[PDB]
Design a protein around this nucleic acid. Structure first.
Lengths: 203, 77, 80, 393, 67
RNA sequence: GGUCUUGUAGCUCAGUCGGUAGAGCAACGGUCUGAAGAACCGUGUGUCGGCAGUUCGAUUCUGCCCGAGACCACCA
RNA sequence: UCUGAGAGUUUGAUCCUGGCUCAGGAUUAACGCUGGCGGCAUGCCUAAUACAUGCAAGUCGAUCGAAAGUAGUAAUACUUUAGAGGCGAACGGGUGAGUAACACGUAUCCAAUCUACCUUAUAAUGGGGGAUAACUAGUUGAAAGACUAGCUAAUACCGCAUAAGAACUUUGGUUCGAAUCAAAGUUGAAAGGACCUGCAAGGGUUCGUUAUUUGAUGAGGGUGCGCCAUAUCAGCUAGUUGGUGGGGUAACGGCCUACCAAGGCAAUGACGUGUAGCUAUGCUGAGAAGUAGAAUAGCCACAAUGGGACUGAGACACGGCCCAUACUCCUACGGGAGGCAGCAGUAGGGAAUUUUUCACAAUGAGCGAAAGCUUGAUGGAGCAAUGCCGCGUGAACGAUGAAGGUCUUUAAGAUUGUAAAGUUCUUUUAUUUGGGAAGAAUGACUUUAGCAGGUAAUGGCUAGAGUUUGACUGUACCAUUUUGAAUAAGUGACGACUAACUAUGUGCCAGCAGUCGCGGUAAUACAUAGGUCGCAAGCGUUAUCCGGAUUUAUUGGGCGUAAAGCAAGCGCAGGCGGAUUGAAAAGUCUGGUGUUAAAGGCAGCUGCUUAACAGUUGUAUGCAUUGGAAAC
């Protein structure tokens, strides 16, 4: 599937909040564990490398929404260069166009960013794209086809949204550039290299 | 088949007859030379040999070879 | 014409009409890309002059590719 | 090219309805010969009246065969309707697809049970204003025998619901007309003028997309399978997409050639004896007698409940009664699929006559639609006829 | 379709074979019978499995359930 | 498309002169094996694929079909 | 630089030894459920089985005669070719039964060879004759055809003189089987066309042609090298190992013949069986290596089977011929026709492999000064989830948790679940509006402008003008182009091996299962339902490959008791070999030179919205030679 469908279910299972801090605190019944009825107490007897690798693969895959064929091919593209594959892979994961526009703060959710990018309303260097996973280069300028600036959802997203040092942006113009690579401390720390590069026994 | 094939065949009957007639006269002259050895018959034989070698009817190499073999028997005689 | 569908490309190579195209060739001379314009064409004219001097020329339109280049105006003197 | 054929004149399909030994084969030969001597492009045919063994060795019709012939007024096709039983499915196959059926009865071979059943089935399935032609009058010339048959054919045609008093009667001799006796051509001209009058046509409309009743399947060397039939509605051009329907899962197909009588069409028509080449299909999945439609909207069905016009036993109904377990052969516009008369609880034995409303269950999912006229038969005798009132599943 | 004669196992509830039917054969390894390793593939144009096969409808040739 | 053929217990199989339904097996119970097999006794079952006739009288003889099995479609 | 995982399976229990299974990819995949689009790849692997019809080989009237027809009163000009003649007809395409060897690829030598046209350079293009076509007529038969007589052209044919150069041999001369030279005999080349100028006499240009020389080009041959198994395969073998002369091929060559000898190969594997088109490469792989030798491109074979021969410069010739054979077919009885492994396409075999689609628009080829012609090559189009890749099937907001369903099992509640409902916003795609490509950034073409030869003028080299060639296309694409959340998720598994539990049903029956094995009356392994997790217009399931599998261990095992030291001794060949001095380098290492087709992969870049993919640049490898070092 291209998308997760429901999100809070996965985040309940992922144990991580894709949002800033909160996805649910009192929804009739709050839980910090797996959803469903079977989740009475099943998290303390499944400690295994296989389970950890699968869980973290789902965490980072659900964190951005990349299908397994695409997820594999993107890792191979990361293997293309040597660099430092750990930080290089993390920088590629955040370099997706939807993640780019999320970090400059014009979207409240990555699903909204994907939906907006797919409709062709986001113009990239005078040539728009329909693939919401574009890999960028430092110094890329964006603009959103200024008609779509009048959108109430975009307005409620972009008034005081995500402020980042590695990307320069202006909400008085809704435009910006990619200054530099983000630092690891500025990215979610619940994602590690070792388990998924191990589950990468393929390559 | 093709109309061009029939065009080729009706034409090539005559040239096949011409080639066999030329081969017959070459062989007759060769036999005459081997009946009596002299430069008189050999001059003729080399003449039509060159004329046939003028076209692709006989390769020039085989003619040079047989003509060398004939000039050899002239030389030892 | 090689590459992708709706994407023509023509490597410039000394060839004779006794061998089919994209089969076996003699020696590479360059490549011509008719897919994208603005004069994409690179030539060597190092042994191509010798090939012209000894016959067995490549295709005829290549003649024109050296008319703009100017090899023709300098070939006749080599020719005579 | 495959000898392209085109025509703009209206096409009325005319057949020789009546039992064998009536001179019907000789009449089919004679009409072709006289129009050969009357109209251009009317090539003669006597060995081409039939195309199968025992079809010509007997001289009297057994199985189907198609002939084509045009006059200086109108074009006509003809299918060779059978005689004796065990082949009646072919005659109704024709009887469903003709709009003109000349009653070729013989004065010396006066209306036989096969002929009377042919007329009754024409009434049941619907043959509008079918004309009569007394035949084989070269034998047994009598003062009143030639006229008692002429009055009784009118009586029998008025005894089913048709118009036996609104049809001109022309006599003739099959052998004398075919051989070329000059005085018998006036009578075949009279017959042609008779099928010119009060014989309608399948209405000309291109707005209807598609529907065809299959009659035969013939595989052609190299081309594939050219399946032939008669169009009920719609017009057809090469390159269009269609869907096969009937007794099999509906599958899409593409037309690649349309023909009259192995001569390629330009524009098909409803009622035309058409033949269409289909790609990627073999006789195993395309069935002789299937139906076909435009892709998108058609539904096969098994069970349906309709008002049936129970024909009276004196009018030709069943010889006896029937229970729920009665299993007669339903005739749907292209095929005899045999179903069961599942009587609703009206009486223990519904009798012929006194038209009822019954539900029926069929083993095969066949295309059904409300109002579509269908026939009910059993072993050479019609036991019912009507149109669909409600389609269930 | 060749002269080889082989024993095989029918999976699922019941059967739809009538002693004269052609169907497809698959491999596999079951250990309840020596030698017997091949099985019959249901739902291939002849014998078909239609017994509320809602889950695992890929094998047995069972159509997707209707809404 | 026609040429014939088949329809018997739940399964595989014969069918009294239209006048009667007959075997084995799964199969219900009992004896017996530590247990399960194997062996032995008794049970059971069919309104004989369905409709209408001929019919005191039909699985049976016909007319109807259906599910199925075999014979071919030349020519040129 | 590159570059690496294991887990379970023996027993009462433990370990070792070995075996087994699972987990990665990958297709020429097939197949079940189903399915939205797009780029791209790819689409008979079976019967080298046979196959309706059509296309796939024509061009040239500036090679030639004649003829028709059109216009013209006519003269004449114009279209066309039945023919004759020229070129391609060998390539272009498909296929891999046959074919284990020079077939493959590489390195050479052809002092043993050929090569029309294309390149260099140069002498000639003079003269005559002869016939056949076509046509006219007859014979012959249904036909294919065949035969006979009279009348025609040439750049078709044949003689006739001439011979820079060339042909042979001979004498003299030179060089390490050959090369250069001087001389003595002998031979042989044809054709004109178009145009221009010139009264003529002639001259000029181009094309065409003979001859000669330079090349290149391709063809032919030999050569070592490495590339299947098979000793439950041991002798094989005589134009066969040779020598002598001749015939013979382009050419060496028992290639073949007349003659004379008896060798040669083989245990380091002949011969024999079975199997195979080969290579690059495709895949696995980290790596030594393995597998396949889809497509694809290079090499070879082949054209219903088997032979024979002509022509072409080159053939025993995918759409040449003749014949035999087999098949099919016409047939009036007398005769004949054909070969889809050329494009399709059909029958059938399978589990399965695409339409009698378009255009020669590009390109390329073939023909022809020239208009122009052919191309089922090729460039497109359609079908197929067969494969890879990209994208939609909405998004944001939205709690005691709506209904319902399930569990807890009633009587709180939880679960599905912000998921629902409801509120807005947006339209890749879906529906409409208008415009719209490049590919035609090659080319003729007649007029301009300049330019080499010589001039008397044509003709040729280059720039400018346009006619211009578009099937694809109103296509890619472009745009505050209308409407519309609408037009669009299935699917394997949940005992463990390896993430994924409850309820009901069955009761070693029914079933599942790759492994251990679960089930014989509460089954976390069966049946169903719910929940759940996995992948997704795809999900699975079978074949073949490799990793694992160190599971024949080159790297990277051993052989005391788990598997094996022959029962032992003598010993040929071969392998491994003491120390020191010298030689060269046969190896070894290394420098230079050439090849190592393109292409594949790798590293970098460019382009299509990014992709996928394609192209661009570099990147290895083995030998051949030359030049160094001399440790082993």
């Amino acid at each position: 599937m291209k998308y997760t469908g429901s999100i809070f279910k996965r985040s309940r299972r992922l144990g991580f909040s894709l949002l800033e801090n909160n996805k649910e605190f009192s929804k009739g019944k709050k839980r910090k564990t797996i959803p469903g009825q079977h989740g009475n107490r099943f998290r303390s007897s499944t400690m295994s490398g296989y389970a950890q690798q699968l869980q973290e693969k789902q965490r980072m895959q659900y964190m951005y929404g990349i299908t397994d064929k695409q997820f594999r091919r993107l890792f191979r593209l990361v293997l293309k260069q040597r660099g430092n594959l750990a930080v290089n892979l993390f920088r590629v994961l955040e370099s997706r166009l939807d993640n780019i526009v999320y970090r400059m703060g014009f979207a409240p959710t990555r699903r909204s960013a994907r939906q907006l990018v797919n409709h062709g309303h986001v113009l990239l260097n005078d040539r728009t794209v329909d693939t919401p996973s574009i890999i960028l280069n430092p110094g890329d300028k964006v603009r959103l086809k200024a008609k779509t600036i009048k959108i109430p959802i975009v307005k409620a997203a972009s008034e005081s949204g995500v402020v980042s040092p590695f990307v320069e942006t202006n909400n008085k113009t809704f435009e910006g550039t990619y200054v530099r690579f983000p630092e690891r401390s500025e990215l979610p720390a619940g994602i590690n290299e070792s388990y998924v590069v191990e589950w990468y026994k393929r390559l | 088949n093709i109309k061009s094939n029939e065009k080729r065949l009706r034409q090539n009957i005559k040239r096949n007859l011409n080639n066999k007639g030329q081969k017959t006269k070459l062989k007759t002259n060769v036999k005459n030379f081997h009946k009596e050895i002299n430069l008189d018959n050999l001059g003729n034989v080399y003449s039509q040999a060159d004329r046939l070698a003028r076209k692709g009817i006989i390769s020039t190499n085989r003619a040079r070879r047989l003509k060398s073999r004939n000039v050899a028997v002239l030389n030892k005689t | 014409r090689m590459g992708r569908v709706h994407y023509p490309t023509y490597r410039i190579v000394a060839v004779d009409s006794r061998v089919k195209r994209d089969g076996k060739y003699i020696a590479l001379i360059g490549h011509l890309n008719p897919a994208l314009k603005e004069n994409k064409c690179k030539i060597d004219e190092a042994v191509a002059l010798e090939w012209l001097n000894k016959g067995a020329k490549p295709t005829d339109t290549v003649r024109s590719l050296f008319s703009q280049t100017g090899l023709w105006k300098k070939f006749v003197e080599s020719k005579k | 090219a495959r000898e392209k054929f085109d025509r703009s004149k209206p096409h009325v399909n005319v057949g020789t309805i009546g039992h064998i030994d009536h001179g019907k084969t000789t009449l089919t030969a004679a009409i072709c010969t006289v129009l050969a001597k009357e109209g251009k492009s009317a090539a003669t045919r006597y060995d081409q009246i039939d195309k199968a063994p025992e079809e010509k060795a007997r001289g009297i019709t057994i199985n189907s065969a198609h002939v084509e012939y045009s006059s200086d007024k109108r074009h006509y096709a003809h299918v060779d309707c059978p005689g004796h039983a065990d082949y009646i499915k072919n005659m109704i196959t024709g009887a469903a697809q003709m709009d003109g059926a000349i009653l070729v009865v013989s004065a010396t071979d006066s209306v036989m049970p096969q002929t009377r059943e042919h007329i009754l089935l024409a009434r049941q399935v619907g043959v509008p204003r079918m004309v009569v032609f007394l035949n084989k009058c070269d034998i047994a010339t009598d003062e009143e025998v030639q006229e008692l048959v002429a009055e009784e054919v009118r009586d029998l045609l008025t005894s089913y619901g048709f118009d036996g008093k609104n049809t001109p009667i022309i006599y003739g001799s099959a052998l004398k007309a075919l051989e070329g006796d000059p005085k018998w051509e006036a009578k075949i001209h009279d017959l042609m003028n008779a099928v010119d009058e009060w014989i309608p046509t399948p209405e000309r409309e291109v707005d209807k997309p598609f529907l065809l009743a299959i009659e035969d399947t013939m595989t052609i060397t190299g081309r594939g399978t050219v399946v032939t039939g008669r169009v009920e509605r719609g017009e057809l051009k090469v390159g269009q997409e269609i869907e096969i329907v009937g007794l099999r899962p509906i599958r899409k197909a593409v037309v690649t050639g349309i023909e009259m009588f192995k001569k390629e069409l330009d524009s098909a028509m409803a009622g035309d004896n058409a033949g269409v080449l289909l790609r990627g299909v073999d006789r195993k999945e395309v069935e002789r007698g299937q139906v076909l439609a435009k892709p998108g909207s058609i539904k096969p069905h098994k069970k349906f409940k309709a008002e049936i016009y129970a024909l009276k036993k004196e009018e030709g109904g069943r010889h006896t009664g029937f229970l729920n377990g009665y299993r007669p052969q339903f005739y749907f516009r292209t095929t005899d699929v045999t179903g069961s008369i599942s009587l609703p609880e009206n009486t223990e034995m519904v009798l012929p006559g006194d038209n009822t409303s019954i539900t029926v269950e069929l083993i095969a999912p066949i295309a059904c639609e409300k109002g579509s006229k269908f026939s009910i038969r059993e072993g050479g005798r019609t036991v019912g006829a009507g149109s669909v009132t409600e389609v269930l599943e | 379709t060749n002269g080889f004669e082989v024993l095989t196992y029918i999976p699922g509830e019941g059967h739809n074979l009538q002693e004269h039917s052609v169907t497809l054969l698959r491999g596999g390894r079951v250990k309840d019978l020596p030698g017997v390793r091949y099985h019959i593939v249901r739902g291939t144009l002849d014998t078909v499995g239609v017994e509320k096969r809602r889950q695992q409808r890929s094998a047995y040739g069972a159509k997707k359930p209707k809404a």
